[PDB]
């Protein structure tokens, strides 16, 4: 996340880091959202490589014990049928990954509540993208979870000709472009966090930014719109 803050520890119980194996370590490489004591939400162009990989919930430094953290095993990913991996504008950026065990639920580690089915954000209402990803452009991952505000922008700006074209479709969100905040590397599958009637909902997996670098003017952030696949979640979640 660029131009973020540190979140406070309790506030953002929902993520999760997506981590691989790599030699005799591990290394996060996405994020993601607690959807069910067993299921993590994430974006399908996260589990494209065929790597070995964990969640963590109750992270919060990814550098230091925090005291709070469970580990968890992916015994099953589930990627959306329409997804492509050359083809993320065309949308379905979107993944469940069943964990080995149920996690245990308290401050650190709850479920991320999902928006009603279809629903859509306002011009300009507030979100909180959340994350571990790069800290600038061409930069280094986050040590502490970060937090930034990114406005939403709707559709019928996001898709005109100087913010992001026919790139974008209605079954995503974008939010922020404001050239001095973003999603990074790193952040892609993490939650857009976005207040509805007093609640925090997540109505956003991260997606993608502009390859012209992370916080650009008028490239906003670009998210899967969660409320669009409501059905599917159900769906898998019922038929696993
Ligand atoms: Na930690």
């Given at each position: 996340v660029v131009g973020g803050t540190e979140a406070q520890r309790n506030s953002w119980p929902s993520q999760?880091?997506?981590?691989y194996r790599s030699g005799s370590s591990w290394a996060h490489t996405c994020g993601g959202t607690?959807?069910?004591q067993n299921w993590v939400m994430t974006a399908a162009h996260c589990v494209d490589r065929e790597l070995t990989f964990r969640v963590v919930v109750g992270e919060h430094n990814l550098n230091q014990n925090n005291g709070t953290?469970?580990?968890?095993?992916?015994?099953?990913?589930?990627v959306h049928p329409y997804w492509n991996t050359d083809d993320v504008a065309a949308g379905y950026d979107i993944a469940l990954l069943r964990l080995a065990q149920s996690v245990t639920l308290n401050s650190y580690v709850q479920l991320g509540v999902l928006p009603r089915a279809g629903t859509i954000l306002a011009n300009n209402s507030p979100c909180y993208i959340?994350?571990?990803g790069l800290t600038?452009?061409?930069?280094?991952?986050?040590?502490?979870?970060?937090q930034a505000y990114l406005p939403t922008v709707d559709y019928a700006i996001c898709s005109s000709s100087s913010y992001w074209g026919s790139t974008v479709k209605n079954s995503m969100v974008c939010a922020g472009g404001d050239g001095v905040r973003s999603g990074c590397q790193g952040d892609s599958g993490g939650p857009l966090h976005?207040?509805?009637?007093?609640?925090?909902?997540?109505?956003?997996?991260?997606?993608?930014?502009?390859?012209?670098?992370?916080?650009v003017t008028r490239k906003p952030t670009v998210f899967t719109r969660v409320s669009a696949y409501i059905s599917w979640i159900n769906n898998v979640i019922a038929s696993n």
């Open positions: 999760i880091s997506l981590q607690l959807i069910r953290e469970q580990y968890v095993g992916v015994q099953k990913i589930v959340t994350g571990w600038r452009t061409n930069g280094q991952l986050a040590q502490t979870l970060q976005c207040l509805v009637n007093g609640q925090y909902a997540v109505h956003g997996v991260t997606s993608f930014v502009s390859r012209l670098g992370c916080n």
